[PDB]
Curated annotation (Swiss-Prot), chain B:
Domain of life per record: Viruses
Name assigned to this protein: Coat protein
Stretch forming the signal peptide: none
Keyword line: Capsid protein, Virion
GO cellular component terms, A-Z: viral capsid
Compartments reported by the entry: Virion
Extra information: This virus depends on tobacco mosaic virus for its replication.
TM annotation in the entry: none
Length: 144, 150, 146, 144, 144, 144, 144
RNA sequence: AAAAAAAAAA
RNA sequence: UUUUUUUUUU
RNA sequence: AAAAAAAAAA
RNA sequence: UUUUUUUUUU
RNA sequence: AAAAAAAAAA
RNA sequence: UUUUUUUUUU
RNA sequence: AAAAAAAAAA
RNA sequence: UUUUUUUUUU
RNA sequence: AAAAAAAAAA
RNA sequence: UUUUUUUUUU
RNA sequence: AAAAAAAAAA
RNA sequence: UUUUUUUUUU
RNA sequence: UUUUUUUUUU
RNA sequence: AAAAAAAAAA
């Protein structure tokens, strides 16, 4: 391959876009109380910590969750996810459980194409329930 | 694919496994468009700092690997003249003396030119570094720089 | 293999992913009472009921609507039925219509909702507007409860 | 594909059923005591918690069981299942044991076609024995 | 081919629809001020000038823009489009520039299927910016 | 498929037309008297009820007709169509009859290409004859 | 194809015939009385209502008949056809009956080639019988 | 799809 | 032998 | 390259 | 059916 | 895609 | 004979 | 990848 | 017979 | 291995 | 249509 | 050249 | 599955 | 030689 | 997938 700078025969000025979209997998943690559902805010996805503070909307494609702290004594870890939608919240409770007390529980859900619209900071993605005090989420989304 | 394919109309369960490897602050390949002011008979040094800005969604980055530079005259040339733009590549390990140049063949049309950086000179640059020197008979140049933010 | 006559052991492994409250794709039949040449808005709430085993849902994604006249038409007339899709992001002005060709037979028509318009609806929402010369309309709605 | 609503050339009124059958995998837990067999009530399968409170009968196809809490000190988890049937109870004790003390024991059994009749709330599916105080069941069944 | 009227052996009364949908490419102009973004209202699409005043909703599919008047002295035309959505506005700025001062600048964006819902008069399609006092838009859409 | 907006690299301003043509199947009804031929006016085709009030001319391609009310006592329904043209009315009487007293009679005719010119509201498309007091018509035509 | 008038290189004067034959299906109705046969007169086929008043002879090929009014109370419609010939009348009574009281009864008969000679107005085609007060006939014939 | 009648073409 | 109109058979 | 209008040839 | 002229489409 | 000039390889 | 740099032709 | 239950299509 | 949802088997 | 987003090449 | 970056499915 | 909407035909 | 009208992609 | 039940090997 | 023990079939 070339070892030196070489000329580019550029033509006319192209179409440009200084603020393009970005497909991402955003990892973050939330605190969870015993017996209480936590509503995961969309605003958690906008932050300089993820290079995403210039975005104000996002299209979530899928949500995966893992317990992030150990479960109570004698128990195996569990985590549940209830998808929320601005046009109407769901009542599914997708749940994963651990089969070794020392291992994380995990589960996820995919959003169908027909339900992939934008959400903003004040929106909530889903409810989390767990017997562990923290849950780690990895959200696959399209910032725009 | 996607020929009548698509998927379901409802949320479905993912049988997730172990916690994956993750990175909250990944890299990003980009083409950044910005303009610079240039003066008659004077070479302007293009600062790398122009590439870090919220106007590009890149203010969380402190380094970038530049891969190629293209330039266009952004304002009209002087009376009776055709536009021209020249690019001289600059490197922290030793500046070049190439003067890549394009000129317009219609006075009403932009001049344009570019250069590609070879793999062996694709290291990082920071805000204090410069990308290239620009010369032109037009008072502004429009640059589109293809680069890897990291 | 098959044709075992007795219980047999399953070599179960790790606890699987589970969900006590899953989705359900359904064709729901219900009727609405209608007046003469008067549009009636069909409520989405008619889809949630113990009579359909769906009272545990609060949302549903409608995929298509079909409608039949349920009582006889006025004297000298053939039955007809009209459907005008309604949407929260913007109502339609289409009026899909069927008419009977025998005075003793039901009129029928339906419409399909495109993938890009298949979002959720709740009980307070309305599915469509119905218009008929008969006093009842029998609807069958294909939908995904979730 | 189409981006607008399209006509459906409906025909005669079809056959309908407002209350159809449902093939399900129902997850629920049962309490178990030391040295004592617990009879799992079929009524545990009818509940708004599973969207099944409008069913009063169910045809069980197979039963799988996992220990749901840690076992006593120095022991590995075990769980046994003895099928019950209204026409005659079995004496099999299908059993699984853990090989790591931190992991669940698991076993299941399949009901043959000739024994897949209906059960009601007052009936029992099986007996569960375990050294763990709780057992998690996932029962494959056809509600009707 | 036939030179006279011929008989049609009609059958039963078909399905009918007096107010059908309509896929269109609507052209209209908007005024733009220096350094100010103009919100393109969706209501502009329901006009007797387009045969569309019987519609109250539309599904937008793609937007294209051209500058419609000459740029300021010494400048080449430019135009920018920022898509707007009721579920969450975008921050993209798709931009084109003229490479000949005497020629229009042009650009567009396509709306993905998952974001192709309906819009009504009070909604806005996008934000337009340009150094020219007028921008010419052609909007591909489905009236319904 | 793509889940977010994408740039379109638009070119020169296209050829446009804000008021295009429209091929349509228009359903409407006319009253008919015993023993009297009813001239169907073309103006019936231009209406807000059809989204066609912006049109002043139309090219009719075919006409199909259905009896719309029940026939006289002891009679089977019939309907006849006589095509009319500005250059010369025809004398054909395309006719259909019901074979069940409770069923609609139907018939239609097709207009040859050499006779497919424009008609305006003052023109008449055909004469309708029937023993029922209303006839349902579906006219295939090209609005321009 | 050509859009202008074009020259025809005609030759010698051709054979001509200002009054040609015509193959036709003629539809008309006759009144029928209970228990009485009605002889269908051939003269009904020559009429300006059929464009055939310039003919005096016709070769009938086949006769189809349909009851034209409702039957008496409690009965299903029926119609019978007995062929009549100048060289010798037949004694066949071809018959159709309705299987639904609201539907027409129908039947026909074909005339063999060896019996396809001419008939004049004073001739009769066939006898019609029915429990309905009117019968609708469609006669396939060759006017000459 | 074939045939008969009128017409046109070859 | 193809097509157009009327008819018929399929 | 085909088609239409005029012409020429076959 | 080939060419020439006018037109049209590609 | 080939060729010529410098270089490198074979 | 292949590649890199400059050039040229296509 | 096949099957069973619900739906849709053919 | 294909797809979607639930289940199951592999 | 294919697809989606940004980029580059063709 | 290939490659690079992010993502996803396998 | 395929697809989507309206129409027509099969 | 072919064509016509609007649209889109190429 | 196929299948069902228990076992075993793979 | 084969084999061994019981059963059933051929
Ligand atoms: Cl749980
Ligand atoms: Cl803007
Ligand atoms: Mg844990
Ligand atoms: Mg230079
Ligand atoms: Mg009715
Ligand atoms: Mg345990
Ligand atoms: Mg310009």
């Amino acid at each position: 391959n070339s070892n030196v700078v070489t000329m580019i025969r550029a033509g006319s000025y192209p179409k440009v876009n200084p603020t393009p979209t970005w497909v991402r997998a955003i990892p973050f943690e939330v605190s969870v109380q015993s017996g209480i559902a936590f509503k995961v805010p969309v605003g958690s996805l906008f932050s300089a910590n993820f290079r995403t503070d210039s975005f104000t909307s996002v299209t979530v494609m899928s949500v995966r969750a893992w317990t992030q702290l150990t479960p109570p004594v004698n128990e195996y870890s569990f985590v549940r996810l209830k998808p929320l939608f601005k046009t109407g919240d769901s009542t599914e409770e997708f749940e994963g459980r651990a089969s070794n007390i020392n291992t994380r529980a995990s589960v996820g859900y995919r959003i169908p194409t027909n339900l992939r619209q934008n959400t903003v900071a004040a929106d909530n993605v889903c409810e989390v329930r767990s017997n562990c005090r923290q849950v780690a989420l990895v959200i696959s989304c399209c910032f725009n």
